[PDB]
Amino acid sequence: HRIRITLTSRNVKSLEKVCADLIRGAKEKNLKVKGPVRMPTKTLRITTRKTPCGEGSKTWDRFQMRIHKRLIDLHSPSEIVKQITSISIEPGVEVEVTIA
Amino acid sequence: GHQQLYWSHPRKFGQGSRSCRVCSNRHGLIRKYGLNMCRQCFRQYAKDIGFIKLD
Amino acid sequence: FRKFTYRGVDLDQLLDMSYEQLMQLYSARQRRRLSRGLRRKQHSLLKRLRKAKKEAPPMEKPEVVKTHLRDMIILPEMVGSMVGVYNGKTFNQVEIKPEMIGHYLGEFSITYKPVKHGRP
Amino acid sequence: ELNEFLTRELAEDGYSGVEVRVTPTRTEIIILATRTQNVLGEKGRRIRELTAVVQKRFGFPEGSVELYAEKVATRGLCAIAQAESLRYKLLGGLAVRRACYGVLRFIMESGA
Amino acid sequence: MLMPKKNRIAIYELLFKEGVMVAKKDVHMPKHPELADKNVPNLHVMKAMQSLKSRGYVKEQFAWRHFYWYLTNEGIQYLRDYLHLPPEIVPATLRR
Amino acid sequence: KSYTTPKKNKHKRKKVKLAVLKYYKVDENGKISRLRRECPSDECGAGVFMASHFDRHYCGKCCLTYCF
RNA sequence: AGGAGUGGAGCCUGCGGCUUAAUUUGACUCAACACGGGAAACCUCACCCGGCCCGGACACGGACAGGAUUGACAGAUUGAU
RNA sequence: AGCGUGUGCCUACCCUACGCCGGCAGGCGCGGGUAACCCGUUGAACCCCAUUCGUGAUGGGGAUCGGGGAUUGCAAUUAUUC
Numbered sequence: 001h002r003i004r005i006t007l008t009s010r011n012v013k014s015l016e017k018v019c020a021d022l023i024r025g026a027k028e029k030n031l032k033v034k035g036p037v038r039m040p041t042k043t044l045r046i047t048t049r050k051t052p053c054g055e056g057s058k059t060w061d062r063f064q065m066r067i068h069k070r071l072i073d074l075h076s077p078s079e080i081v082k083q084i085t086s087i088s089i090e091p092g093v094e095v096e097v098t099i100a
Numbered sequence: 101g102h103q104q105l106y107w108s109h110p111r112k113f114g115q116g117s118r119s120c121r122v123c124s125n126r127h128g129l130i131r132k133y134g135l136n137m138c139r140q141c142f143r144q145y146a147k148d149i150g151f152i153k154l155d
Numbered sequence: 156f157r158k159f160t161y162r163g164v165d166l167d168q169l170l171d172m173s174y175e176q177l178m179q180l181y182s183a184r185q186r187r188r189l190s191r192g193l194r195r196k197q198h199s200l201l202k203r204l205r206k207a208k209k210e211a212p213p214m215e216k217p218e219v220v221k222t223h224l225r226d227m228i229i230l231p232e233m234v235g236s237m238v239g240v241y242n243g244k245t246f247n248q249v250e251i252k253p254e255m256i257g258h259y260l261g262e263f264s265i266t267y268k269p270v271k272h273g274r275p
Numbered sequence: 276e277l278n279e280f281l282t283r284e285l286a287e288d289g290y291s292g293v294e295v296r297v298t299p300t301r302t303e304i305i306i307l308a309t310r311t312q313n314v315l316g317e318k319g320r321r322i323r324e325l326t327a328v329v330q331k332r333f334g335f336p337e338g339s340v341e342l343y344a345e346k347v348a349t350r351g352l353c354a355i356a357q358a359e360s361l362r363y364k365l366l367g368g369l370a371v372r373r374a375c376y377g378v379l380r381f382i383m384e385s386g387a
Numbered sequence: 388m389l390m391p392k393k394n395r396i397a398i399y400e401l402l403f404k405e406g407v408m409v410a411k412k413d414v415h416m417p418k419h420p421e422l423a424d425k426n427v428p429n430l431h432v433m434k435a436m437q438s439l440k441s442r443g444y445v446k447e448q449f450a451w452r453h454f455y456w457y458l459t460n461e462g463i464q465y466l467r468d469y470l471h472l473p474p475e476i477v478p479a480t481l482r483r
Numbered sequence: 484k485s486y487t488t489p490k491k492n493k494h495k496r497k498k499v500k501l502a503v504l505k506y507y508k509v510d511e512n513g514k515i516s517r518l519r520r521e522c523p524s525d526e527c528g529a530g531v532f533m534a535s536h537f538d539r540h541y542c543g544k545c546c547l548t549y550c551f
Numbered sequence: 552a553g554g555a556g557u558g559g560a561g562c563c564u565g566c567g568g569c570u571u572a573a574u575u576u577g578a579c580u581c582a583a584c585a586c587g588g589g590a591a592a593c594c595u596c597a598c599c600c601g602g603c604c605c606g607g608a609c610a611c612g613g614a615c616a617g618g619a620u621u622g623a624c625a626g627a628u629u630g631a632u
Numbered sequence: 633a634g635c636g637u638g639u640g641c642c643u644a645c646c647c648u649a650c651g652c653c654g655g656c657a658g659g660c661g662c663g664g665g666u667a668a669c670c671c672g673u674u675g676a677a678c679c680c681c682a683u684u685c686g687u688g689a690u691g692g693g694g695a696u697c698g699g700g701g702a703u704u705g706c707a708a709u710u711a712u713u714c
Contacts, residue, residue, distance in 0.1 A: 039668065063151035091295065112706090184708080222631090327479075328407045328455055550625075
């Protein structure tokens, strides 16, 4: 059973914390764990005017969001990796499970 | 024929088919990534969405 | 004394033909308009408009029928008909000559007045 | 939308913040306030009402949404609760200088 | 109002079984998202409980597009002696 | 606002008093009769009545028009 | 010291003025004038000519199951079944 | 080459490789992508090379205007667009 788990979040430091904890857990559980594949991050750029009406110097904002996505690959049966993945999930980090 | 001529006008497409989902106005809509509001409401509620003006 | 001819066919020849070849007798936009769909969704007004046109006064000046539809393409069957179409304020009562074919009722009712400037 | 929701109801309760935590096939919404006894109402009526309206509004499954109401520590350090306290002080009718001096001094001995 | 008798009592036992009400503010919604089994728009629903507000039995506050009607104890009494129910059936907002 | 144009009014409906006795007619014997025709439609069934006009026959809610 | 220009030519857009039944309106030095995120065929629409419905709650007095009211097809009508 | 974007709640309206037809604007059955996977190695333009032009309101400049054909939409006329 080849299994893929995706660690997609908005904040990056809690993402590094949970990915390091998952890699450490797969290391201590005597399991063949692959390295964390770092996908190219996606920048959310939409610009708008400052003032609500139409007068003033034409000044704009640059609002930004960065979403980071990570990949961890394992070779393990289903129930043990469910038991691993259902431990200590952050509210700002979303995990999703896929099977090949 | 009040029932059949009250709103027989097709608002299938066009600008008035969509509206702001915060304050229901039809000017300056942002449709990108499905926000579906005007610019003022997005600027007022932009912090809880998570958009920061870092750049 | 001159006899009118449209696209090589005569007036009664135009009357006694149908839409299935009349679309190719029309231009590009009018073929697209008549081939778009049935005149039922909004053009039940057009259906009853040709019905009210098919109402026949006797051998005199035919009675004028007026409508708000400015998007009506002149069929060959309604030549020699008296109609006033709404430009927004009044009805411009116009005589349908045997030349109208290929146009709209909005071609023959002006909206803006012709401007005549005075002193700035 | 949930933030503007809970500050529309919980203005008199002294609202401070919201937290959403995700669980498999379960939604957790944590309500931060200061009047943790008035937020429940009598026998938990109003928090059940809020659970029902958020479940019916947001298309949520039946029996998967629950609301936990925990009061916030260090009441003088959250600026939103002091803002609603000043709003309800000025709404009842009182001098604005006395109320602003009172909230300023309360924030000052509160540890800021 | 030109409302049928069935629609008024329909919103009534929907409100009596569960004492909460959510509706998006638009007049051209042909069927309710909850009452799609029968034929009733939202305009009937908002005008009926606006009449219920004016007779003084429910509360109200407004979101972006969503109304929020809440039930009162005298509202429970009014729905009880209007829908003609024995007083042992309770709305789910009180009983846990 | 009163204008130069004359004011139009809605239908003030004419009031009829006890028209149900004009549906059936009673004789001096023991029988019940139907003066007008009954609509044979399924949902527009055996309860409602149907008109008697100078040229046509028309029902109330099912809208089936009959003429000679 | 220079470079690219604008202002002159045709066109797009905006503003003033003129006409119109309406040519909706805010803004007039920097800090109004491809500004209102305003690239308007319908909606937008707030301007003009026309016609429907109440979506006038709640309370009082008439009204009233012997009827408080709603909906509609022969044919004229405006514009429309 | 590089920033990007992509099947949306009431809300239906996405980005597109590939085959045929047609000068072209375009049309039909076919496959992928809910995205570092598919468009895509984004065969972009200015530039580079080789002919034609030769100081002429000229093969510069494309305003104005006539006729015809497709697409979007319930509807284009005061030409939507091509």
